[PDB]
Amino acid sequence: GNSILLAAVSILSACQQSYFALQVGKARLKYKVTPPAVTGSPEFERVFRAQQNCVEFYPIFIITLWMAGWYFNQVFATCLGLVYIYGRHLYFWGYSEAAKKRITGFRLSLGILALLTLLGALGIANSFLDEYLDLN
C-alpha cells in the first residue's frame, strides 16, 4: 500500500532484466555462437558482458531502492529508480555498439545508486534514533 510505487518500479526493472537476458539469446543466434560458449563473435561478448554487468548491480539497486523508498521517501526513490532503469537502458545498448559508448549509462546508473544508498542510510539512521535511542 505504502510501497506500491516501489513494487511498480521493481516490476518494470525486472522486465528490463528479463529483456536484456532475451537479447543475449538473440545475439547467440544472430552471431552463431553455440552454447555453452560465450566467446567467438566480438558482437556477442559485448552484449553478454553488458548483460552480466546489469545482473551484478541489480540486487544492489533493489535493496537500495527499497531502503530509500521505505525509510526516506517513496516518491523520490521511485523517480530515482526510473532514472536508473533508463541509465541501464543507455548502458546496455551503448555497450552493444561499442565499449566506449557504455560510460554515460554506467555513470548515470552508479550516480543514482550512490544517492539511493545515501538516502537509505539517512532514513535508517533517522529511524534508528527513534526506536533504539528513544529520540522520538
Place this chain on the structure above:
Amino acid sequence: GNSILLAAVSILSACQQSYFALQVGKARLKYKVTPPAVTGSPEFERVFRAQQNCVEFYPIFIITLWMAGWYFNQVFATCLGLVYIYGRHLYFWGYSEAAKKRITGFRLSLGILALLTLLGALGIANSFLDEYL
C-alpha cells in the same frame, strides 16, 4: 499465514541456488578445472553456464514471485513458484548433459516468469487504482 507460503518457496528456491553453486565447485574436481579458470572440459563449461544462467534469472524470479504473491494471490503465485523450481531443476541437469537438452526446462521456467510478472503487474495496477477510491 501472511507471507508464509512465499517465504517457504523462497527458502526452497534459495536452497536449490545453493545446490547449483556448489555443484560447480564439485565440477572443478571431477573435470579438473583449477581456479580461477572456467574453461577446459566441455562438461564443466555446460555446468558452469547453466548455474550462471540460473544466477542471472534468480532475482527476477524472487521479485515477480513476491509481487505476484503479495498483490494478486499468494497460493497461486506459490504454486507457480514451485513449477519454476522444477523447471530450473530440469534445465540444470539438462544443460549438464548437453546444451540442447536445456530447452524444456528453460522454456518452462521463463513461461512462469512471464506469468508471474503479468499477475504482479495486474495486481499492482489493481492496487494503484485505489488512488481513485
Place this chain on the structure above:
Amino acid sequence: NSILLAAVSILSACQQSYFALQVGKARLKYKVTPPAVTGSPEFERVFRAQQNCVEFYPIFIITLWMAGWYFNQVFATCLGLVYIYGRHLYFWGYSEAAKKRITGFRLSLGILALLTLLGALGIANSFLDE
C-alpha cells in the same frame, strides 16, 4: 522494525558495490580490455572472487531476511555481520591466491547454512501454527 536487517543489507550492498568496482580497477592495472574477463592470473582471481560473491548474494539476502523475520532479528543481524566479514576474507584471500580463499568461503557458507536453518525453522514453525 527490521531496522537492523535494513542496516545490514545496506552495509552488504555497499560491499557488493565495492567488489564490482574492484574488478574495474583490476582491468586498469592488468590491462584487460572490455568485454574480456580473462588474461592476467592476478586479474582472473579478482574477477572470479567478485563473480562468486555475486551468485551467493541473493541467497544471503533472502535467508538473512527470512531468518530475521521468522526466527530472530538480532541473531540474524549478528550472523549477517559475520557473513559480510567472511566475504571480506574470501575476496582479499582469493586476490592473493586461490588457495587462501578457503577460510573466507567456508565461514560465509557456514553462516549461509545457519541463516538457512534458522529461516527454515521459523517458517516451518509459523506454517504449522497456521
